[PDB]
Symmetry: C3
Subunit: 131 residues, 3 copies
Amino acid sequence: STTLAIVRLDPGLPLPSRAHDGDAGVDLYSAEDVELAPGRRALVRTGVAVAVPFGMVGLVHPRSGLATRVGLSIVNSPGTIDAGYRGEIKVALINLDPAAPIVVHRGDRIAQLLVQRVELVELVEVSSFDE
Amino acid sequence: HMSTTLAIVRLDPGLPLPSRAHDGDAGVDLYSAEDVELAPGRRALVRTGVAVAVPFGMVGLVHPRSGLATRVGLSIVNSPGTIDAGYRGEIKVALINLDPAAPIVVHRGDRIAQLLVQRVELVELVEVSSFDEAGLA
Amino acid sequence: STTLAIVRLDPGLPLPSRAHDGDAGVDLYSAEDVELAPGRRALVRTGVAVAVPFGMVGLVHPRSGLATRVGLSIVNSPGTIDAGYRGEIKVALINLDPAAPIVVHRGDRIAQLLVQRVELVELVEVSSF
Ligand SMILES: O=c1ccn([C@H]2CC(O)[C@@H](COP(=O)(O)OP(=O)(O)OP(=O)(O)O)O2)c(=O)[nH]1
Ligand SMILES: O=c1ccn([C@H]2CC(O)[C@@H](COP(=O)(O)OP(=O)(O)OP(=O)(O)O)O2)c(=O)[nH]1
Ligand SMILES: O=c1ccn([C@H]2CC(O)[C@@H](COP(=O)(O)OP(=O)(O)OP(=O)(O)O)O2)c(=O)[nH]1
Ligand SMILES: [Cr+3]
Ligand SMILES: [Cr+3]
Ligand SMILES: [Cr+3]
């Protein structure tokens, strides 16, 4: 029941929002219009930056509707947004369809952002495991 | 440690009930209610014959099965599939054959993916003019 | 503060480490050299095995740099490391670029590992919703 500081690098876009209570993420908009040819990819700017709390992590997930209907996916899915990252959030989209192209319009919801805690583990090297 | 329960409805009473192979196993395997064949590069939305009630504050995640991933190149377009807490519909998996030549034959009753459940920070967005001005440089 | 036991099966690679305080994961290296032609995949060794605490889960995430740059992805992303597992972590790399083959050399960072709690939920069958 955390707050996430967000800066709208592109004031021309709506502020990402949680569709329904409980909804895992908030949809991210595309700041640009782009066409992905079958098999081709693209790094798309979302017009936003966020400040994920220390001990937490941002996760860029693909939208299931578009995923099925047009084969639109994310190459590095899940996208990993570190707590210290202050740059702009970009989504590496890819058209996984075999023959049809994917049209992306400035203003479309091209991904969803989730926020979860993360175990900042201290790795301790051992000679072997206990059995 | 001691968690909660997850209410599950077998929409298709012909498939087994998903379960946790081992105690510490992150998730439970989901079965395919249908027979499907994925030609190379082709995809499909396959039904799992189940619906769930992910508790408020938690999310359901649909991950691929490493085995089939390596052996035949089976993947899931929207991995990780996000199952929202308020969703009460049937879980479906967007299976895709990432292999270059060999089709992939899916049989009703096969384990096609696994489902994990985690808590999820239901963050409240707070727009700020800039990180510097907000003291977040 | 949670600690993660880890064995460098291949003593010739650096121990995986967290780039910055706050960074979600730690980059896992490649223990071998591999070239993936377009559309081709390969299960790569990392030269390490870990011991995910009971109640937690490991997760293998692709690195965004290479994904955008050369189209390098992970077939089963996110890779699930169960608490029970004690074998070598292997990554299922795949070349999603149309024409350019991908070259990986021993010592490269091919993936990042995350650890998170997981709800070991108890399934209960019910009649309806
Ligand atoms: O592997 C999946 C992913 C999603 N769903 C369902 C359940 C759920 O929460 C809803 C929507 O998924 P999502 O929010 O990812 O995709 P969307 O394209 O953004 O659609 P929606 O507009 O309904 O939010 O779709 C599944 O059955 N299986
Ligand atoms: O979909 C994404 C993925 C990552 N990032 C940013 C935020 C963040 O945490 C940082 C690095 O992501 P990552 O660790 O995946 O890529 P990398 O290639 O491993 O590089 P690095 O950690 O070296 O900066 O890059 C995005 O804006 N969008
Ligand atoms: O990116 C990955 C994913 C899995 N593994 C290993 C570790 C681990 O837990 C085991 C396989 O568990 P998993 O649920 O992924 O595979 P499965 O296909 O569902 O099969 P099962 O539990 O029968 O093995 O494989 C990796 O090394 N890398
Ligand atoms: Cr939604
Ligand atoms: Cr398993
Ligand atoms: Cr990093």
